[PDB]
């Protein structure tokens, strides 16, 4: 790749028919209305920085007998929007993180009454030493985590 690792493509199912590509070189990748975000998505419903994706070095506790990935990288999806995003089947509350498995469909905004439906398809084109690329790290099948100063710090300098 020339600098692209993950591809988030606002599919036709969403009001947006565009394709976004997270330049592996940029970490973390910010998405939202304001062009300031590495990704450009303007939806009056979401905030200037509705959400951002961050890549981190994947590492387990121990390797007794079995030898896991040892120490590779995994892409994380962070959400900071008020409308809360939805990843596949997990809820994303303002200040949450989620693993992005190859072919991860993330819902940025969904309105039942407003019929406002959004969603991006994550397609890993390049694997920057990815432990795998994003299969769900076994056992833990798609679980939502909380964000900390580390994540908030990245957006703070947005």
């Amino acid at each position: 790749g020339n600098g692209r690792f993950l591809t988030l493509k606002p599919l036709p199912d969403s009001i947006i028919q565009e394709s976004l590509e997270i330049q592996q070189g940029v970490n973390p990748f910010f998405i939202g209305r304001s062009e300031d975000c590495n990704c450009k998505i303007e939806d009056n419903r979401l905030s200037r920085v509705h959400c951002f994706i961050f890549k981190k070095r994947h590492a387990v506790g121990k390797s007794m007998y079995e030898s896991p990935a040892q120490g590779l990288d995994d892409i994380w999806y962070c959400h900071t929007g008020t409308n809360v995003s939805y990843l596949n089947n997990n809820r994303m509350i303002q200040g949450t993180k989620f693993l992005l498995q190859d072919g991860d469909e993330i819902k940025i905004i969904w309105d039942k009454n407003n019929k406002f439906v959004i969603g991006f398809k994550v397609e890993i084109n390049d694997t920057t030493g990815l432990f795998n690329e994003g299969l769900g790290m076994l056992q833990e099948q798609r679980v939502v985590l909380k964000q900390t100063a580390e994540e908030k710090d990245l957006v703070k300098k947005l």
Binding site: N44, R45, L46, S47, G81, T82, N83, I109, D111, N114
Partner: peptide, 9 residues
């Protein structure tokens, strides 16, 4: 001229 987030219920 807009600059607010339409937070849904």
């Amino acid at each position: 001229e807009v600059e607010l987030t339409q937070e849904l219920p």
